[PDB]
Subunit: 354 residues, 2 copies
């Protein structure tokens, strides 16, 4: 298909928000600004240090833009955790996002990975050097079990980027490949487990709840991100591999059938999220619910996804979906539309030179 | 579900072996005995050392039986790798199997996992202490990429056993839980990656086929093991959680529907295995095929799965399936039925006292 499935897309999005019970919360705009700036400020100072500036090969502007998108994602989705926790997670998820910019073959730097790890010697790959050095600031917020999940998921992600460098959508007929890759780079267990700071939750008392949340949130989070991203990726001849495009190549089905598959998985996952946790520990359901809502709000407000375009184009249609959509959208903007000048300053590069 | 779906099990099993093209190979009985003894001898001496005897808390008889099952699994499935590789892998997979015996909460021994890892200090949990100390003997056989996969999968497996201690089949309605747990403790990427020793394969030249093999083989081997195991588990109130039983609890379907799901996944996986690799690099297809056949042969011959029982009971039925089954079975026994006295000696405990 060449024309974007605007109608089909709107319907799915509306069903999605309704399933997760998208609705206003007590998390105010002023509170978001307060959190956005705190998280951004600590992270910016971190990436501005000489060592970080040295080992992390990234274009300054790309770094600035990456840091800002991640800070917004964390502050909006991990609504219930402390300012420090939001800050430390912002730094970690900015490291992960930035690794996708590397085109350098990991092979030479991974030949002695285990031996250096076991012996406690700094890793040859600079990214690992920075990420493992900083990890304790993230792990200090969690119990041993959740920490193990963050560590595994980040290791998986590193392998994920390695594979991504081959721009391989899978062999025709390799049905297990698409999701195999999406899980590898989705950071599902990192996200799912970072929602439970030991300061607010008891890892041993809620072990079953948490484990279940990690398992379910893993797929909800990656599928929602894929769906919300479908619009910006539609015309991007630069983005050649994605869950949807890989479904097409590996399963040998049409882009529309691929999008349908994603839609069914996303809705089903949303439905089961609510069915399973609504009657469980209220604190757990709150974190889960606020994450889903924040995650959606972030996608709707961040320019990167350009959903503002879908809005503009259908804010005058009397369709049922088009209207339900614009309402949800306006709701997001209301609390999420914030000018970067209100929190993202000064730029990282500025702090770096000083 | 009070009676074994024997007829269904026979049909599925036959279809399984036909799909993967089960047939005789040049791997002779005498060659297996030669490999069985070599692998067992090196591993037995390893586990008999004082340090290993000390930190590894396992009942001697259980250790002996676990070592013998694993050596068989490796020698029969990793048919194309060297004797040393078979031995070192037998040691590693015996460590993983034995971890399932632990009833000790991992929590206290994982509180400082990352900091000790980062600093190069011996891990507090004795299993990690032994496994990481021994790991290089396994990793030396592979390139950096495959090594990364073995490391991740083993780390996942450790989390898997942690979760297994709660004997939790998942919340009703938690559809993503069953497979989440099966992947966690399936060692899928460990198995899939350990099929490519750098001595026989070039990790960079075959990156795509290996990555694809890891992705597809992960599900094939866990599902086949579950199916092959359905028998010995059909009436074991001890093995309360399993992929099938978790499908029942989490998806709220009948045991028969669960078993059907597993059957469809197993056959479809087998079908896609052959379709994707048959026309690829012949050495790659050979390793994959021999692994599938060896893995099946091992399940058919190892007493643990008691498939010999299914045999006796239907070797005189003139059903099409029952006959195709007994033929395949006899084929396995022909080259796989080997008395332990021919290779598994002396017992680990004997070597430990000396």
């Amino acid at each position: 298909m060449e024309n974007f499935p605007t109608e089909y897309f709107l319907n799915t999005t509306v069903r999605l928000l309704e399933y997760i019970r998208y609705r206003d919360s007590n998390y105010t705009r002023e509170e978001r600004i307060e959190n956005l700036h705190y998280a951004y400020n600590k992270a910016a100072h971190h990436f501005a240090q000489p060592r970080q500036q040295q080992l992390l090969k990234v274009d300054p502007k790309r770094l600035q833009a990456s840091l800002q998108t991640i800070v917004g994602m964390v502050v909006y989705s991990w609504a219930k955790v402390s300012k420090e926790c939001m800050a430390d997670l912002s730094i970690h998820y900015t490291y992960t996002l930035v690794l996708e910019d590397s085109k350098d073959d990991p092979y030479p730097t991974m030949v002695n990975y285990f031996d250096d790890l076991q012996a406690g010697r700094e890793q040859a790959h600079p990214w690992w050097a920075l990420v493992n050095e900083h990890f304790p600031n993230v792990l200090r917020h969690f119990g041993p079990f959740c920490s193990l999940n963050l560590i595994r998921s980040t290791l998986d992600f590193f392998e994920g980027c390695w594979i991504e460098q081959y721009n391989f959508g899978g062999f025709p007929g390799s049905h297990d490949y698409p999701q195999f890759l999406r899980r590898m780079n989705g950071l599902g267990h990192c996200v799912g487990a970072s929602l439970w700071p030991k300061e607010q939750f008891n890892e041993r008392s809620l072990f079953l709840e948490i484990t279940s949340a990690i398992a379910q949130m893993e797929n909800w989070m990656v599928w929602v991100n894929d769906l919300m991203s479908f619009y910006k990726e539609f015309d991007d001849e630069r983005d050649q591999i994605s869950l949807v495009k890989n479904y097409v190549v590996s399963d040998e089905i049409s882009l529309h059938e691929a999008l349908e598959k994603l839609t069914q998985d996303t809705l089903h996952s949303s439905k089961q999220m609510v069915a399973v946790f609504s009657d469980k520990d209220p604190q757990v359901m709150d974190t889960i619910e606020c994450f889903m809502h924040g995650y959606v709000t972030w996608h709707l407000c961040d320019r990167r996804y350009r959903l503002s375009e879908i809005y503009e184009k259908v804010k005058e249609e009397k369709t049922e979906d088009a209207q339900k959509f614009c309402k949800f959208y306006e709701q997001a903007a209301n609390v999420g539309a914030v000018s970067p000048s209100e929190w993202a300053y000064p730029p990282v590069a500025q702090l770096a030179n000083v």
